[PDB]
């Protein structure tokens, strides 16, 4: 039982080490200095280069249908250099085959898709913590208020089962609803070889959504949705009902701390053997890595670096939809809601004035650390809608879940003595997007 755990830690550490040494190689090939190599924007550009090089289907489509004024075999992005204290952006182009060769050499001749999925999840968490998806919600007919279930909505399809565990109930419901809408518009959907393939995809997506749910009634209802040969308006409405029910009887969404490649690269250049020590995405390893890591970022004029650092922290720990009180307790500084953050996204646009831009250190440090959970809490005839409604009516927004679990100090590596928070003082806000 312990041996399997140590092999799992070794495998995850192998992925992290590969990502870090790839970042080191990319920094060497880009002639970036230490400060420029620790910039979060440069790491974002490099990670996007990796992801676009290995996006096989998009690369093939680009070869068949070339883009306007772009070479379909070259990736690129904004790389920022500091000259005489002034930041300037550059668009440098790299062959996709060169990027693939460098990535494979980083992972010892193996095309380790696990690290790519890790970077994909990091980008998805950043997008979740930065940008809201209300327009897509309204277009598909779902309430804009179920944003807490839309974790991992920007994850592409190539993530697979690893990324499927991260995406929430809202995104899966949205994708299924898109499929049902396409079937409703065109009857030739679900027909032919493409019809068989999309039926298989629909069944698989329904099955992983069913695995997401906890109560028996929700599982039975998604089973009934899956069993329809030609799902129509009724199944789309039932999916909307399940999505709304997921607000109270929550689902099992897996949360992992996926750090930017700059942190991993700095750690690997420091001499940290993740293969020997081992890495966990749900334990103290990301917290310990973030405490002694220095990351720099680009601050547009009239912005608060503290707010940007809080945003990056929330993205790193996938705490976008977390209770603000527990997030502030773990961080030690007040996690301000999205409305009161005087900051825009991490990424810098191509039209920005790259002469007033400044650089700031990111405070990615927390007082306490906690275990990241997959569970959504405790949940306590042939029409299971009434049963679901009764179950949610019984629930109150005062029940204590995760009983006997607390936040551990950074020195408590083994998670022995928990600290339970007492939120029984004057009430702060609880919803990040509120």
């Amino acid at each position: 039982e312990r041996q399997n755990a140590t092999e799992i830690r070794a495998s995850v550490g192998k992925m992290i080490d590969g990502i870090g040494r790839f970042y080191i190689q990319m920094c060497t090939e880009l002639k970036l200095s230490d400060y420029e190599g620790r910039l979060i924007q440069n790491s974002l550009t490099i990670e996007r280069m990796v992801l676009s090089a290995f996006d096989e289907r998009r690369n093939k489509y680009l070869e068949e249908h070339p883009s306007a004024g772009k070479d379909p075999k070259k990736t690129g992005g904004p790389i920022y250099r500091r000259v005489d204290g002034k930041w300037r952006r550059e668009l440098i182009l790299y062959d996709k085959e060169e990027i693939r060769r460098i990535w494979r050499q980083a992972n010892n001749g193996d095309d380790a898709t696990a690290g790519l999925t890790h970077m994909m999840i990091w980008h998805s968490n950043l997008n979740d913590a930065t940008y809201q998806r209300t327009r897509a919600l309204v277009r598909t007919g779902m309430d804009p208020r179920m944003c807490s279930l839309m974790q991992g909505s920007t994850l592409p399809r190539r993530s697979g089962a690893a990324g499927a565990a991260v995406k929430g109930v809202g995104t899966m419901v949205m994708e299924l609803i898109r499929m049902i809408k396409r079937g409703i518009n065109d009857r030739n959907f679900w027909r032919g070889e493409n019809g068989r393939r999309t039926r298989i995809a629909y069944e698989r997506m329904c099955n992983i959504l069913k695995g997401k749910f906890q109560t028996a009634a929700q599982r039975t209802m998604v089973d009934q949705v899956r069993e329809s040969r030609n799902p129509g308006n009724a199944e789309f409405e039932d999916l909307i009902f399940l999505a709304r029910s997921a607000l109270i009887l929550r689902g099992s969404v897996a949360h992992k701390s996926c750090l930017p490649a700059c942190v991993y690269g700095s750690a690997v250049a420091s001499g940290y053997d993740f293969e020997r020590e081992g890495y966990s995405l749900v334990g103290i390893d990301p917290f310990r890595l973030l405490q002694n890591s220095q990351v720099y970022s680009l601050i547009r004029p009239n912005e608060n670096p503290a707010h940007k650092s809080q945003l990056v922290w929330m993205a790193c720990h996938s705490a976008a939809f977390e209770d603000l009180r527990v997030s502030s307790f773990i961080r030690g500084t007040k996690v301000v809601p999205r409305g009161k953050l005087s900051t825009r996204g991490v990424q810098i646009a191509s039209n920005e004035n790259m002469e007033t831009m400044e650089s700031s250190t990111l405070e990615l440090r927390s007082r306490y650390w906690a275990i990241r959970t997959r569970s959504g809490g405790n949940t306590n005839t042939s029409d299971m809608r009434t049963e679901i409604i009764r179950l949610m009516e019984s629930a109150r927004p005062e029940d204590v879940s995760f009983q006997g679990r607390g936040v551990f100090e950074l020195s408590d590596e083994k998670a022995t003595s928990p600290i339970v928070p007492s939120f029984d003082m004057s009430n702060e806000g609880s919803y990040f997007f509120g």
């Binding site: 804009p144 879940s401 009983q403």
Partner: peptide, 28 residues
């Protein structure tokens, strides 16, 4: 509009808050 409910990330005791009247008013 906004965020009605919390999706827990950290395994901590905590009350899990949600806007009960808003969720329930769509089920009455």
């Amino acid at each position: 509009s906004g965020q009605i409910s919390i999706q827990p990330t950290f395994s901590v005791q905590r009350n899990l808050p949600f806007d009960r009247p808003t969720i329930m008013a769509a089920f009455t």
